[PDB]
Design a protein around this ligand. Structure first.
Ligand SMILES: *[C@@H]1O[C@H](CO)[C@@H](O[C@@H]2O[C@H](CO)[C@@H](O[C@@H]3O[C@H](CO[C@H]4O[C@H](CO)[C@@H](O)[C@H](O)[C@@H]4O)[C@@H](O)[C@H](O)[C@@H]3O)[C@H](O)[C@H]2NC(C)=O)[C@H](O)[C@H]1NC(C)=O
Ligand SMILES: *[C@@H]1O[C@H](CO)[C@@H](O[C@@H]2O[C@H](CO)[C@@H](O[C@@H]3O[C@H](CO[C@H]4O[C@H](CO)[C@@H](O)[C@H](O)[C@@H]4O)[C@@H](O)[C@H](O)[C@@H]3O)[C@H](O)[C@H]2NC(C)=O)[C@H](O)[C@H]1NC(C)=O
Ligand SMILES: *[C@@H]1O[C@H](CO)[C@@H](O[C@@H]2O[C@H](CO)[C@@H](O[C@@H]3O[C@H](CO)[C@@H](O)[C@H](O)[C@@H]3O)[C@H](O)[C@H]2NC(C)=O)[C@H](O)[C@H]1NC(C)=O
Ligand SMILES: *[C@@H]1O[C@H](CO)[C@@H](O[C@@H]2O[C@H](CO)[C@@H](O[C@@H]3O[C@H](CO)[C@@H](O)[C@H](O)[C@@H]3O)[C@H](O)[C@H]2NC(C)=O)[C@H](O)[C@H]1NC(C)=O
Ligand SMILES: *[C@@H]1O[C@H](CO)[C@@H](O[C@@H]2O[C@H](CO)[C@@H](O[C@@H]3O[C@H](CO)[C@@H](O)[C@H](O)[C@@H]3O)[C@H](O)[C@H]2NC(C)=O)[C@H](O)[C@H]1NC(C)=O
Ligand SMILES: *[C@@H]1O[C@H](CO[C@@H]2O[C@@H](C)[C@@H](O)[C@@H](O)[C@@H]2O)[C@@H](O[C@@H]2O[C@H](CO)[C@@H](O)[C@H](O)[C@H]2NC(C)=O)[C@H](O)[C@H]1NC(C)=O
Ligand SMILES: *[C@@H]1O[C@H](CO[C@@H]2O[C@@H](C)[C@@H](O)[C@@H](O)[C@@H]2O)[C@@H](O[C@@H]2O[C@H](CO)[C@@H](O)[C@H](O)[C@H]2NC(C)=O)[C@H](O)[C@H]1NC(C)=O
Ligand SMILES: *[C@@H]1O[C@H](CO)[C@@H](O[C@@H]2O[C@H](CO)[C@@H](O)[C@H](O)[C@H]2NC(C)=O)[C@H](O)[C@H]1NC(C)=O
Ligand SMILES: *[C@@H]1O[C@H](CO)[C@@H](O[C@@H]2O[C@H](CO)[C@@H](O)[C@H](O)[C@H]2NC(C)=O)[C@H](O)[C@H]1NC(C)=O
Ligand SMILES: *[C@@H]1O[C@H](CO)[C@@H](O[C@@H]2O[C@H](CO)[C@@H](O)[C@H](O)[C@H]2NC(C)=O)[C@H](O)[C@H]1NC(C)=O
Ligand SMILES: *[C@@H]1O[C@H](CO)[C@@H](O[C@@H]2O[C@H](CO)[C@@H](O)[C@H](O)[C@H]2NC(C)=O)[C@H](O)[C@H]1NC(C)=O
Ligand SMILES: *[C@@H]1O[C@H](CO)[C@@H](O[C@@H]2O[C@H](CO)[C@@H](O)[C@H](O)[C@H]2NC(C)=O)[C@H](O)[C@H]1NC(C)=O
Ligand SMILES: *[C@@H]1O[C@H](CO)[C@@H](O[C@@H]2O[C@H](CO)[C@@H](O)[C@H](O)[C@H]2NC(C)=O)[C@H](O)[C@H]1NC(C)=O
Ligand SMILES: *[C@@H]1O[C@H](CO)[C@@H](O[C@@H]2O[C@H](CO)[C@@H](O)[C@H](O)[C@H]2NC(C)=O)[C@H](O)[C@H]1NC(C)=O
Ligand SMILES: *[C@@H]1O[C@H](CO)[C@@H](O[C@@H]2O[C@H](CO)[C@@H](O)[C@H](O)[C@H]2NC(C)=O)[C@H](O)[C@H]1NC(C)=O
Ligand SMILES: *[C@@H]1O[C@H](CO)[C@@H](O)[C@H](O)[C@H]1NC(C)=O
Ligand SMILES: *[C@@H]1O[C@H](CO)[C@@H](O)[C@H](O)[C@H]1NC(C)=O
Ligand SMILES: *[C@@H]1O[C@H](CO)[C@@H](O)[C@H](O)[C@H]1NC(C)=O
Ligand SMILES: *[C@@H]1O[C@H](CO)[C@@H](O)[C@H](O)[C@H]1NC(C)=O
Ligand SMILES: *[C@@H]1O[C@H](CO)[C@@H](O)[C@H](O)[C@H]1NC(C)=O
Ligand SMILES: *[C@@H]1O[C@H](CO)[C@@H](O)[C@H](O)[C@H]1NC(C)=O
Ligand SMILES: *[C@@H]1O[C@H](CO)[C@@H](O)[C@H](O)[C@H]1NC(C)=O
Ligand SMILES: *[C@@H]1O[C@H](CO)[C@@H](O)[C@H](O)[C@H]1NC(C)=O
Lengths: 146, 182, 182, 155, 183, 146
């Protein structure tokens, strides 16, 4: 199966971001998520949208249950993404921690990019230089559409 | 720092604590221990040590299910953990206790072809965040799993639900048949 | 209607009875009865009722496998039904009998958090018909499942294979451990 | 994993590449043909119910036609191929929409924009269902307007 | 063979023996014998024949699990093969011997929906590449032995491939009957 | 769920193929493998890449362990593609057993299409005429780039 959850642009508030203000992303960034089976930000975007729906449209039981996410885990995310990042962890390669992210932003118009998850290694956050090729080619691909 | 000369980079961090209500979260605290929060009310607690809290080889699964004093989510997570072992083929290594709704599970560990390999390999998946993959050998002898209430249990790492949603696919894909009919 | 001048909003309805040969088809009638037709020969009636049919907590299901007096598809689909029950722990809560080839299962169910919610969740997933996902209870005290003939009893809903195909994936995703070495 | 079933081709009212459905498939309707443009989208779009139902109907046709008839019928083949034909988590998402008390698809009735003059047609998408009853056209007309906006993009 | 003036069709074939150190390779000697090799030193020989090496219905499976003098990969393959047999209910058909770490699992095939249908279906899925009858699979050979062996070149009828095993992995614990109320 | 494995153009050595020189495919076909979900050669290439770097990045185990592949069979290959292939085999549709592949190679410039597999039936590879129509669309899609 493949992820099918929709995104009811989508802005992330202060609650799901640690030490930050309300943040918003353009329609193109969220639209790019719907046809790509490798991104990491799309996963947490779906998890947070789903979570918000869970609080507002489902009352808290007296004894809360984990069965709800069990039956609907792969509808939100590609679990093989987690398995693949586990493989990069095992194989000494920089893996994705899913915690710290990075994203390019345009100065004049604020035309952002879909964030690509930071690649950690050795229990520490990498230098900017190691993925400088990645951010450079992402910038090239972003200026390509203009 | 304008990387393309007109694009500036900006970092971002996701506060996973908002997922407390629905999904179960995981922290590491110390290297030895690894903690799981099932909401803010109850949470499992995984430890490695040289002591032993269970001194008997019996576990009494069926009696615990019959009494049904336990909490459903915690037993579900223990089920996902135990079934997710690659090659569990030693029932003697397992032991546990379910007195009065408690959860208290324990695994014994001990060239490399033992259950220590399997339990450690699933343990690394359970709580997440450069030798070979096979036969990771922890110095500690016994693994314990218990239930605990909620306090500050996040020192090495922030909460992360990656592991629990990860091994759900692995929950039954590596098991040895124990009887001609399963 | 008509939108944007040269685009008419047509409609389309799917006759699902054509797929009766290839996989089972579901049904609904009343709020209790939910038929499911394995093919053009027989099906399973899944009826909620207050009046039980089996007054004993015995199955001897392994003997049912041994004698092989039943039809394979019926045992397969009811196995898919039972395995997908989320957090099934009380085995007294279901009785059954397979003597003579007929299948007759009876899930007994009787503040919320018990086997009743899981049985009802898998029941509504078998055939589709607030905040009532967890604390789901029905006034009816028993759920009978029995093989049945092909006299169509589906008025509330047309046939559809969606429930069974959906529940096939979620087969062993929510099973508890019952043995040390599965 | 992901659906991989290739839809067959009906070379009747349209040229090869498109697809069609007979009167057996549909209640209260004649033969309906969708061109190659609509069915080509099904091979990439993972979030379309009608594409899954088309794959189900096509596999049913080929199974009931070319394979030998069973002396005692069995449901083994679908039990093997259920995830190969269709994405199960689309059914899970529809169940989630049901549980959340949101409009949801029960795969029965669909809608599709049809062109008056040239006779072209967009890919059908499901009529969502709320409170155990079909929605009015005005309730979800925003989706219809957006689909018209996307439909004019090709032409 | 030129096409459209400028494109020339060139065939290419992949050699999967390089995967011997990562995953099992299933191959065929002929319609009777089949070899699922693991490493350059282990393999499982599947063999259909009327002859019997197992003549007792006493598996002693759990005792062999307790003893643990067998290669883990072979037992994993055996468990995957047995779990994925569609609609297995007759427990007397299986009969296993694990004397001192050995692997010798015989399924008694001994009429269309019987256990032999599921056994032969998963068998043909194991050794791929060796109409229209998915069900009512018939085979004159009466018993199906599964015996361990050392590595030997026996992939004559088909090249070694992993696709049978990897495709079969998805079907574990999906086409089985219940056996206990609480499981 | 769906596969998420990333490949290491892409070149294929002499030992890893049968009586074959060093074959290199351009970046465009390997990028085509990222989004496609039913390409035989792309999946087999991902398997071979995993094996290739797993042999050398990790020290070989004294005892061979199939545990590694079972944990991540789905992240590399769409098992449902194998189910589709088996369904074509059992329906006696022509079907691919992953062995023999073909591609349209440009004679002068040397660029090569993405390999499509050789559908085999009756225990013998089909002639080129028996599926030449499928080759024609493969040529026509190459015409689109120019
Ligand atoms: C994977 O994600 C993890 C969760 O974000 C990362 O953990 C964070 O790692 C950074 C360093 O890379 C820590 O900063 C240090 O934290 C340690 C531990 O104490 C921290 O936690 C306590 C309890 O909440 C808090 O009171 C402290 O202020 C720290 O936040 C300190 O000793 C250091 O001085 C320094 O502050 C983060 O604290 C830590 N997360 C937390 C809060 O647990 C992890 O680094 C990521 N992967 C990698 C690259 O290792
Ligand atoms: C259960 O599934 C069965 C398939 O396993 C369905 O069987 C199919 O039924 C249809 C409809 O009868 C057959 O399609 C054709 O039927 C016509 C005769 O009746 C139809 O056509 C006339 C006009 O020609 C029309 O007046 C009638 O209203 C019908 O629409 C034949 O002349 C055609 O040759 C063709 O048979 C399928 O062929 C048939 N498949 C078979 C043989 O299994 C069955 O209808 C489904 N319904 C149930 C619940 O049993
Ligand atoms: C999807 O949901 C809609 C809305 O519930 C369903 O529409 C309903 O379809 C059933 C089909 O039997 C209709 O029942 C029919 O009612 C007439 C009333 O006279 C009766 O004469 C027929 O014998 C039959 O009982 C029902 O009225 C109709 N409407 C509602 C609101 O239920 C649709 O069938 C569902 N599709 C599936 C397959 O889920
Ligand atoms: C989309 O809309 C077009 C019409 O704009 C549909 O084409 C139409 O197909 C029907 C099929 O019955 C034609 O109806 C019949 O036409 C003949 C004369 O050609 C007449 O004698 C019959 O009494 C009946 O009216 C209809 O005329 C024809 N319209 C044309 C010219 O395009 C098309 O089927 C629709 N497609 C879908 C699936 O929405
Ligand atoms: C996919 O199907 C094709 C067609 O059956 C298989 O090709 C055949 O593969 C076998 C095994 O390699 C070949 O047998 C060999 O013949 C040579 C020459 O006599 C001999 O030296 C070898 O020891 C072996 O007996 C067979 O000739 C070959 N036939 C064709 C038409 O190429 C292919 O192996 C299958 N691949 C898989 C993994 O399913
Ligand atoms: C694990 O179970 C064994 C076996 O006894 C079963 O479980 C008991 C809880 C009870 O339901 C028995 O009827 C079951 O047969 C327990 O071993 C027994 O322990 C009791 C005291 O708990 C003692 O009186 C018996 O002599 C013991 N031995 C037997 C019956 O052979 C064991 O204590 C159970 N462990 C736990 C933690 O509950
Ligand atoms: C289910 O079996 C129980 C237990 O008996 C065992 O299983 C039988 C099928 C048979 O193999 C017996 O020898 C087994 O011991 C039956 O309950 C009683 O079983 C005893 C013997 O243990 C027998 O003397 C009694 O007559 C049985 N009681 C009744 C009321 O018949 C039970 O009957 C079986 N139920 C069904 C529906 O088959
Ligand atoms: C990207 O940068 C733009 C600014 O170029 C941010 O938009 C806001 O712009 C106004 C007017 O210049 C400022 O007053 C705000 O402070 C800006 N917001 C922020 C966050 O600084 C836009 O928000 C930025 N987007 C991201 C998430 O990078
Ligand atoms: C658990 O997560 C919930 C998610 O809702 C948090 O609830 C929010 O908490 C903030 C901060 O106190 C409030 O401003 C919001 O109104 C709350 N929203 C709700 C209940 O919908 C809660 O704070 C988290 N608790 C912990 C201990 O992490
Ligand atoms: C865990 O396993 C070890 C294996 O070494 C056990 O250690 C044995 O303890 C017994 C106690 O009577 C000694 O007689 C043995 O010599 C020890 N070694 C072995 C190899 O058996 C240990 O007891 C086990 N602990 C638990 C709690 O199960
Ligand atoms: C189904 O379960 C209910 C609830 O446990 C059973 O109802 C009880 O049956 C016992 C039998 O000893 C009576 O003593 C109790 O009075 C009943 N409960 C109440 C609240 O009155 C019921 O018997 C079970 N039915 C079966 C097994 O057929
Ligand atoms: C369920 O199936 C069984 C087995 O077919 C039915 O039991 C009897 O089976 C024989 C088999 O030919 C029939 O002759 C009998 O007619 C069946 N029972 C009787 C006495 O009618 C059982 O009836 C079926 N239950 C249903 C369909 O309600
Ligand atoms: C199993 O695969 C390994 C890994 O490719 C093979 O080892 C290579 O063998 C060739 C033989 O010519 C040597 O040139 C290479 O140096 C070896 N190592 C590597 C990393 O390629 C091994 O031969 C294969 N074994 C079998 C039985 O097929
Ligand atoms: C395989 O199963 C067949 C069929 O049950 C067995 O054949 C029967 O064996 C018994 C003794 O075990 C004889 O009394 C019967 O006459 C045999 N029946 C037939 C039809 O041949 C056979 O023994 C089993 N083989 C093994 C090796 O277990
Ligand atoms: C199958 O596995 C068994 C497991 O024992 C192999 O038995 C070997 O037998 C020889 C002769 O007695 C012993 O020296 C070896 O130590 C045994 N090996 C092992 C690994 O235990 C047997 O050779 C294997 N192969 C076959 C064809 O039976
Ligand atoms: C990581 O850094 C440590 C020192 O902190 C070094 O010893 C080790 O070799 C480095 N490589 C790894 C394990 O990533
Ligand atoms: C990585 O390099 C940058 C640039 O010199 C430096 O600021 C940063 O501290 C380095 N990070 C680590 C973990 O060494
Ligand atoms: C903290 O980590 C150390 C690691 O050696 C361990 O001994 C200790 O038990 C852990 N827990 C506490 C509460 O100190
Ligand atoms: C947890 O959060 C809930 C939110 O409703 C609150 O009622 C409760 O008091 C908190 N604490 C515990 C221990 O559950
Ligand atoms: C459904 O309702 C009707 C009318 O009240 C009733 O006759 C029937 O018994 C009910 N359900 C069934 C199938 O028993
Ligand atoms: C839907 O349309 C029906 C028929 O015109 C009408 O009776 C009903 O009130 C409408 N509901 C809404 C709010 O669209
Ligand atoms: C198949 O080959 C085996 C040896 O592997 C041989 O014993 C047997 O007779 C052969 N069977 C045939 C040709 O049917
Ligand atoms: C093997 O099976 C026999 C059959 O009689 C049984 O008696 C014996 O206890 C079993 N042996 C072992 C070692 O489990």
């Amino acid at each position: 199966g493949t992820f099918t959850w929709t995104l009811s642009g989508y802005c992330l508030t202060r609650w799901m971001l640690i030490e930050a203000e309300l943040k918003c992303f353009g329609n193109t960034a969220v639209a790019k998520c719907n046809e790509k089976h490798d991104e990491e930000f799309c996963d947490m975007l779906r998890l947070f949208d789903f979570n918000k729906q869970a609080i507002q449209r489902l009352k808290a039981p007296a004894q809360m249950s984990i069965q709800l996410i069990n039956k609907a885990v792969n509808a939100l995310i590609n679990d093989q993404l987690i398995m693949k990042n586990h493989l990069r962890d095992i194989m000494c390669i920089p893996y994705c921690n899913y915690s710290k992210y990075w994203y390019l932003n345009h100065t004049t118009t604020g035309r952002t990019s879909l964030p690509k998850c930071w690649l950690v290694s050795n229990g520490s956050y990498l230098n900017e230089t190691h993925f400088s090729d990645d951010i450079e080619q992402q910038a090239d691909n972003m200026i390509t559409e203009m | 720092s304008l990387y393309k000369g007109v694009y500036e980079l900006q970092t971002l961090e996701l506060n996973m604590e908002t997922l407390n209500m629905t999904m179960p979260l995981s922290c590491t605290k110390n290297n030895s221990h690894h903690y799981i929060m099932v909401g803010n009310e109850t949470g499992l607690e995984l430890t490695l040590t040289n002591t032993s809290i269970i001194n008997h080889k019996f576990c009494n699964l069926s009696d615990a299910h019959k009494k049904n004093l336990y909490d459903h989510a915690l037993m579900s997570i223990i089920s996902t953990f135990h079934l997710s072992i690659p090659n569990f083929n030693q029932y003697e290594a397992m032991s546990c206790d379910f007195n009065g709704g408690k959860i208290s599970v324990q695994y014994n560990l001990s060239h490399c072809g033992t259950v220590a390999n399997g339990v450690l390999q699933t343990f690394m998946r359970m709580a997440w965040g450069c030798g070979n993959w096979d036969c990771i050998m922890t110095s500690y002898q016994y693994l314990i799993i218990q239930n605990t209430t909620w306090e500050d249990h996040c020192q090495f790492s922030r909460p992360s639900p990656i592991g629990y949603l990860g091994l759900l696919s692995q929950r039954t894909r590596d098991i040895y048949i124990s009887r001609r009919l399963l």
